[PDB]
Curated annotation (Swiss-Prot), chain A:
It comes from the Eukaryota. Heterotrimer of 3 chains: alpha (C8A), beta (C8B) and gamma (C8G); the alpha and gamma chains are disulfide bonded. Component of the membrane attack complex (MAC), composed of complement C5b, C6, C7, C8A, C8B, C8G and multiple copies of the pore-forming subunit C9. It comes from Homo sapiens. N-glycosylated; contains one or two bound glycans. Not O-glycosylated. This is Complement component C8 beta chain. Component of the membrane attack complex (MAC), a multiprotein complex activated by the complement cascade, which inserts into a target cell membrane and forms a pore, leading to target cell membrane rupture and cell lysis. The MAC is initiated by proteolytic cleavage of C5 into complement C5b in response to the classical, alternative, lectin and GZMK complement pathways. The complement pathways consist in a cascade of proteins that leads to phagocytosis and breakdown of pathogens and signaling that strengthens the adaptive immune system. The gene is C8B. Belongs to the complement C6/C7/C8/C9 family.
Swiss-Prot record, chain B:
Belongs to the complement C6/C7/C8/C9 family. Component of the membrane attack complex (MAC), a multiprotein complex activated by the complement cascade, which inserts into a target cell membrane and forms a pore, leading to target cell membrane rupture and cell lysis. The MAC is initiated by proteolytic cleavage of C5 into complement C5b in response to the classical, alternative, lectin and GZMK complement pathways. The complement pathways consist in a cascade of proteins that leads to phagocytosis and breakdown of pathogens and signaling that strengthens the adaptive immune system. The chain holds residues 183 to 232 of 584 of the full protein. It is linked to Complement component 8 deficiency, 1: A rare defect of the complement classical pathway associated with susceptibility to severe recurrent infections, predominantly by Neisseria gonorrhoeae or Neisseria meningitidis. It is found in: Secreted; Target cell membrane. The lineage of its organism: Eukaryota, Metazoa, Chordata, Craniata, Vertebrata. This is Complement component C8 alpha chain. Heterotrimer of 3 chains: alpha (C8A), beta (C8B) and gamma (C8G); the alpha and gamma chains are disulfide bonded. Component of the membrane attack complex (MAC), composed of complement C5b, C6, C7, C8A, C8B, C8G and multiple copies of the pore-forming subunit C9.
């Protein structure tokens, strides 16, 4: 009597993830005339008006 | 250019700009005082993500 056996197994797993985000903003103002307190109030870069 | 600050008159109920001192004297050593008005305001923003 002769008995023989063979077994084999393999597992492969690869994972990849990429994330890229970009955002910019720019502002240019050019005001001529009446450089008093009110135009400094209007010189507020965040609010548009 | 700053002749608009403030002035009040209770007895006359009058509201107007202060008309006391509106003149600037120029010394001999100065060519010109060049009363003008300019304004340039620029904000820069950079947001990057990796």
């Amino acid at each position: 009597g002769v008995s023989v056996g063979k077994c084999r197994g393999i597992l492969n797993e690869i994972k990849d993830r990429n994330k890229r985000d970009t955002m910019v903003e720019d502002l240019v103002v050019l005001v001529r005339g009446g450089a008093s307190e009110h135009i400094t109030t209007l010189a507020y870069q965040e609010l548009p008006t | 250019g700053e002749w608009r600050e403030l002035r009040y008159d209770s007895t006359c109920e009058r509201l107007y700009y202060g008309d006391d001192e509106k003149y600037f004297r120029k010394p001999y050593n100065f060519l010109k005082y060049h009363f003008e008005a300019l304004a340039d305001t620029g904000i820069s923003s950079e947001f990057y993500d990796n």
